[PDB]
Copies of this chain bind each other. A is one copy, B any other.
Amino acid sequence: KFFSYILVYRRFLFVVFTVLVLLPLPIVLHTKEAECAYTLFVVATFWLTEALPLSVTALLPSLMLPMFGIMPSKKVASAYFKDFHLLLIGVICLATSIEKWNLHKRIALKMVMMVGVNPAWLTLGFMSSTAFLSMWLSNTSTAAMVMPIAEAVVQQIINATKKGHVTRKLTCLCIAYSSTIGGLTTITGTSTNLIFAEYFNTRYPDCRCLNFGSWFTFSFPAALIILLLSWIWLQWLFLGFNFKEMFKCGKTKTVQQKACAEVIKQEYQKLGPIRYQEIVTLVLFIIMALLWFSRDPGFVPGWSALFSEYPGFATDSTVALLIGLLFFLIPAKTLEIVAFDYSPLITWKEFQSFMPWDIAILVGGGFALADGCEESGLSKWIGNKLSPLGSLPAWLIILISSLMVTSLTEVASNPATITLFLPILSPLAEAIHVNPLYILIPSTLCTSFAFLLPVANPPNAIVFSYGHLKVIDMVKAGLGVNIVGVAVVMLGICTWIVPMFDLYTYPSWAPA
């Protein structure tokens, strides 16, 4: 009669309880650190439990910080839009054109035709293609783009069910994990790397280490090993290894194999000859990638030397916008008889869909919360309280931080997790007198390792929404993939990250 109503209004009562129980913290401490800690705790509680929508919670700092007097609303509003958002707009413009003109379908079908219908090699081909695509596009868009095609290919291979369901589960999980793994290789690949680069360059403006080439040259060896080991782990866990049928060349002819291959060939033929919209989209994709790579990598100043009087004004977001806004200008189809006009090959109505406005607001809210934590002085207090932790061995601190971030990223979004630890792990670095990158790189790499739960990151939810995967089947694979990723990151940090970044000494661009 009374307890029944409590379990129905769980979210409302939990939000009210969270707001009221943490109230004694700023009510009687009369410090800005306490008020910002109250705001941080409320935002973290609502992001972890998802009592409110993530983007609604991200708007709380713009409501609490101005009222607590920590920083004016004009200053909070200026932190909701950064170069991350411009890059996201420019890349969503490209992704909308790829999705609209079925270029991804052509690439996926050609990859399936070239690799074959062997379930051991088909999964590797899908993972490689999805990881390469996620190297440039966002993980969420890559997962939402490849998966509808992977399922379509798999269900037509099965038709041409003790083995079908496990095959579709394996295909779901391989795409979900490969999007994330491929997003690690580049700064622009995922939102976590973009947020980390923005925070690192704002907090340490005297460091010129993080560019495209330097990030790639250490994130590719780790990501390739992680991808190969995850493919092996998934193949063993779901289907198992049959080496004789796998390593054999095209010599044993089976009727049901060409029966499956003919369906894929007929689908690719029904796709039709390549249209010029697909060619233009592919050319613009290649140009965007080449301009991202051509901005100074370290050995040759590609086109940053062209603007070598305003350093740092034109960035990768400028390249993304320049390429993406061309998708609003290049004509695609006509309609003269009626309207005497053309179509711009991407309409703004089509761009407004598929554009992650919620992710933009979430990242802006995280950046505003970090700015409030820096302005109020909470970051300095946290760094001072973690000063005695500097007597421990260095590697243990990085291991513990990476494990904590990895554990907390399985239930909270990657952009939220990375924004709640950079203002904590960054001040902690100089409280030990150790290179901040030596802690930040493993932490930002382990923030992306979100494979256990569907709520961990949008790539997991997109794949889980198809209903093929159970929670336990996903957790079993995510545990192994996450262990592989953490082991590879820690091996790289101890082996090949320290020569190029010189992590064993204290840098000259860090505060003393």
| Partner-B contacts on A (CB < 8 A) | 4, 7-12, 15, 52-53, 55-56, 59-60, 62-63, 66-67, 69, 71-74, 77-83, 85-86, 89, 307, 309-310, 312-315, 317-318, 321-322, 325, 328-331, 334, 336, 338, 340-342, 347-348, 352, 355, 357-358, 364
Contacts and interface: CB of A to CB of B under 8 A. Distances in A.
Given A67-B307, A72-B313, 10 more contacts: A8-B334, A8-B338, A52-B328, A62-B317, A63-B318, A63-B321, A74-B83, A77-B317, A78-B82, A80-B81
A21 to B, nearest CB: 17
Contacts of A72: 310, 312-313
B78 A314 contact: no
A11 B342 contact: yes
A466 to B, nearest CB: 15
Nearest to A341: B8
7 contacts: A4-B338, A12-B330, A52-B328, A59-B86, A73-B317, A77-B83, A78-B82
B9 A342 contact: yes
Given A85-B77, A358-B348, A313 B56 contact: no
A59 to B, nearest CB: 6
Nearest to A347: B53
Contacts of A314: 66-67, 73
Contact of A322 (B4, B56, B63, B77): B63
Contacts of A321: 59, 62-63
Contacts of A341: 8-11
Contact of A69 (B83, B313, B340): B313
A238 to B, nearest CB: 24
Given A67-B313, A310-B69, A315-B73, A325 B357 contact: no
B325 A12 contact: no
Contact of A86 (B53, B73, B352): B73
B59 A89 contact: yes
Contact of A352 (B9, B11, B82, B358): B358
A334 to B, nearest CB: 6
Q: Which 7 pairs across A and B sit closest by C-beta, in order of nearness?
A: A69-B310, A81-B81, A53-B348, A80-B81, A72-B313, A66-B313, A56-B328
A357 B355 contact: yes
Nearest to A74: B83
Contacts of A358: 348, 352
A86 B62 contact: yes
